[PDB]
Ligand binder design. Structure first.
Ligand SMILES: Nc1ncnc2c1ncn2[C@@H]1O[C@H](COP(=O)(O)OC(=O)[C@@H](N)Cc2c[nH]c3ccccc23)[C@@H](O)[C@H]1O
Ligand SMILES: N[C@@H](Cc1c[nH]c2ccccc12)C(=O)O
Lengths: 324, 333
């Protein structure tokens, strides 16, 4: 199988956009690819934050990914800091990365971790002979750097690394912000009323969906039109993504119906989806023995592959081999 | 337990009399008085592009040179940097508590960038943070280095204090141990420039593994000054070459500059250079004699690296565990 690598931020608070788009897509392709999920706690500390919240957030992220359907028997899921090889290769690749490349990444008070993390990201990918990396637009420059580092290192020492590719085909589900249906729903939003988080209760979902922007059409008509009726179209897309019903099916279902009925059905459908997900989440999250065993097994698998690459990197560079 | 000494040297170029006087001399003398840990910093060496065969050979050369200088593996921990993963691990973590402006202002980064304009890499920029990690891993009290590493060590102190201020008594704040004489041995044909272990002009340098006969000839050709009459006197501004020769003689013999100045009253630069040549040539002959016994004994060099890496890993893992707990990582099972 081709190897897929994804880096999951611990501090992230996932939305229905994250789940119904990319994550649900990838949960169903775990037998097609050798999928690797790395909870990137070493990347997280580039932003200063409360230590106890970071530890909590790492375990929250682990349980949530497991709740979404990531299978630790099929996929490799692990914590970044538990595999030393990431930091080790990170340093090695610094010496084959131009300062210029990092300065040009899209002043004196910035920490060196924030300046240097694209090299650690390159190490995260290249450690596991990664074939494919599913990235968003804002991470595309970083993937290109990892491809450039890999080719540069390979040209000097032979084919040590696989040159990774972006995972091109996009999810399918379109989830836009509730008060700004032109902008995509993103976990990074400051206006929380634009998003619906995966751990939101049914009362919170009703509140946010009720407030969601629609249009001033008279009569109100539930029809799909991203240009003229962005808000109503987003509500249809969300409902479609949840239930699997096509857009023209929903358009027929809501014939002669106001936006109040649509919003009611959207809220009900999303919370129906989020309840089964939350059940799994809280069950996994409160079982510390389960989470510890997943992290141990995951790190053991990751380390097996990671150490083989780093050995070849170290041999190529010419370091004296460690005496075990 | 004794206070801890930590220091390192790169397996790149060929270590000089400068590297000896500024660092290695002090390393040997500190072994009983303090708990000493010495490192061959191969991860730092690759910030300048190395040939793979040259790096491997130079790592083992440097190890053998420590042993030849008198670094006893029964007294001190001797290890290769890349053999202990914790250096790279704490190296990354400390990037997040190091400012960009601190690294860009570094003299060594600027000097090396001008020299290797075709390879101004991120490793060369990030050099001080990994160096800080090297020191802070072992609860280090003293760091014996030459004058040129003063700025790097000052940042290690700032990082340690900055980290401790947030999280508690995780690191010891290290102190420099820079010698009185021989802290910055200067180049023989350019006494205003520091002696480099990778100088393009070999006549500037006294290599520790260089033929003594070649070294004596280099001392004879070292530039002095136009003073009439010639006078053996210490004056860095006006008599840089003579002052550098006196500094080298002082560091090798243990005699003070005023003691040597009095000794060379009524003498000129022939006497000075004769004494410097005799003292240095005698030192290098003995050193090189021990070196080949160590360097050609691969089984012994392998055992030193194994034992040393094991001892270092025990200290390093303890510190990294505490660092990781403090910043809020989930602890490894
Ligand atoms: N002309 C000279 N005169 C007197 N002393 C000199 C001269 N040139 C060099 N030195 C000193 O030799 C030591 C090794 O230098 P390196 O370039 O190998 O290597 C260096 O410059 C360090 N960054 C290696 C290192 C890495 N991590 C560490 C942690 C603690 C101490 C040292 C290190 C140094 O002490 C240096 O000050
Ligand atoms: N930089 C990514 C996280 C990440 C770290 N390493 C990666 C490797 C591949 C993909 C993603 C990652 C983010 O901020 O979202």
């Amino acid at each position: 199988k081709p190897i897929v690598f994804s880096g999951a931020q611990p501090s992230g608070e996932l939305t229905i956009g994250n789940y119904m788009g990319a994550l649900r897509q990838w949960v169903n392709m775990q037998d097609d690819y050798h999928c690797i999920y790395c909870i990137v706690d070493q990347h997280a500390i580039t932003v200063r934050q409360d230590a106890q919240k970071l530890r909590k957030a790492t375990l929250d992220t682990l349980a949530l990914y497991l709740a979404c359907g990531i299978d630790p028997e099929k996929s490799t899921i692990f914590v970044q800091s538990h595999v030393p090889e990431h930091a080790q290769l990170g340093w090695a690749l610094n010496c084959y990365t131009y300062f210029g490349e990092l300065s040009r990444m899209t002043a004196e008070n910035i920490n060196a971790g924030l300046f240097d993390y694209p090299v650690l990201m390159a190490a995260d990918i290249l450690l596991y002979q990664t074939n494919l990396v599913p990235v968003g637009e804002d991470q595309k420059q970083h993937l290109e750097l990892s491809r450039d580092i890999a080719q540069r290192f390979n040209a000097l020492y032979g084919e040590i690394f696989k040159v990774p590719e972006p995972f091109i085909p996009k999810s399918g589900a379109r989830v836009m912000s509730l008060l700004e249906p032109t902008k995509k729903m993103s976990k990074s939003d400051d206006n929380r009323n634009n998003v619906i988080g995966l751990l939101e209760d049914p009362k919170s979902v009703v509140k946010k969906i009720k407030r969601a922007v629609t249009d001033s059409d008279e009569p109100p008509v539930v029809r799909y039109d991203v240009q003229n009726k962005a808000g109503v179209s987003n509500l249809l897309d969300i409902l479609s993504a949840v239930t699997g019903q096509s857009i023209p099916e929903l358009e027929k279902q809501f014939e002669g119906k106001m936006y109040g009925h649509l919003k009611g059905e959207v809220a009900d459908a999303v919370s129906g989806m989020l309840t089964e997900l939350q059940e799994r989440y809280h069950r996994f999250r409160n079982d510390e023995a389960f989470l510890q065993q997943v992290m141990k097994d995951g790190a053991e698998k990751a380390s097996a592959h990671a150490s083989r690459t780093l050995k070849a990197v170290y041999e190529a560079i010419g370091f004296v081999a460690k005496r075990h």
